[PDB]
Design a protein around this ligand. Sequence first.
Ligand SMILES: C/C=C(\C)CC/C=C(\C)CCC=C(C)C
Ligand SMILES: [Mg+2]
Length: 340
Amino acid sequence: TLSGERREIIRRALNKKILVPNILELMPAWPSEFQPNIDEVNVEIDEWLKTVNVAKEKKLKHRARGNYTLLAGIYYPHCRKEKMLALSQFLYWIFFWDDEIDREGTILCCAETNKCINDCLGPEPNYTPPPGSRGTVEMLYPILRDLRAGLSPVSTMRLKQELHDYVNGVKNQHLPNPWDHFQMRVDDVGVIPSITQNEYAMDFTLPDWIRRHEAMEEIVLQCTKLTILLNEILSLQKEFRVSQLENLCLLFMNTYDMSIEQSIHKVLGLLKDHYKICIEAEARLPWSTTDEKLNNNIREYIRGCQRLATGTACWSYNCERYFKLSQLNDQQELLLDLSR
Ligand SMILES: C/C=C(\C)CC/C=C(\C)CCC=C(C)C
Ligand SMILES: [Mg+2]
């Protein structure tokens, strides 16, 4: 039965301590940087959060442990400070929304959220939340409006589809097979809208014909996979402690009777594989022989993709969403601790 499988995983992983190498070292060509106005933007974010209709203690737990302005600051380290506000607000939205979301309640929330996405990003814009909107939907209307104000319709269409994909993936969601779990996250994970928001952050539009080029599709895919893989390792302690066993490390343990150490090693191996694929795709991009602006846009778009992966790791090593920062030693090696 499913309960026997879950119970045995818990039995095998309980109280295990695993030292994880610094994941940033597995992506050595891709540097991590910090937007220089994070503190100033956080002051704005704190004033804004007072107006958000999410419980005070919940907003504060996210602000304290997640501190998503820092995440935006690492995703978008070269944007101007004026862009940082909407970018930080969006991350507060998606984490609040994911937190707050009972099959009926989920279906209703997803429908109201998809409606907001259509209202704000679709061909007949309406930025006014319907009366009686829940807090995590009401707050999304002005965020999408502000993002759309700094986006071409080309980029807006991609953001719209990507947000629908995220919301519908949440709606749709034996222990599962590890590869089924991985592929589901590759389709469903909320990271692609962050790649598109680099176009907002750096005020440019990547043309569709380049976005659809096999090598650019590959880079987006590889960076999505890399972000998932490192998140599986970095979130293992958090998820195991609330008995959320659908973590890739535990699924490798279950399906293949791997030890927890072997399974983490396997995920780290996949990270290195997909990084090398990603790097090799750059040579195949349709770089222009003449157009500096176009090539700067291609460069910025792929740096945005790479920063999703390095930035999610770097942020995880600089906040307390996933573990206590005392669990890092002086080499940024993480001592996971699956105690309860
Ligand atoms: C799966 C979580 C991560 C890869 C961390 C970075 C992800 C985002 C910034 C958007 C996803 C938001 C969620 C609440 C899952
Ligand atoms: Mg996770």
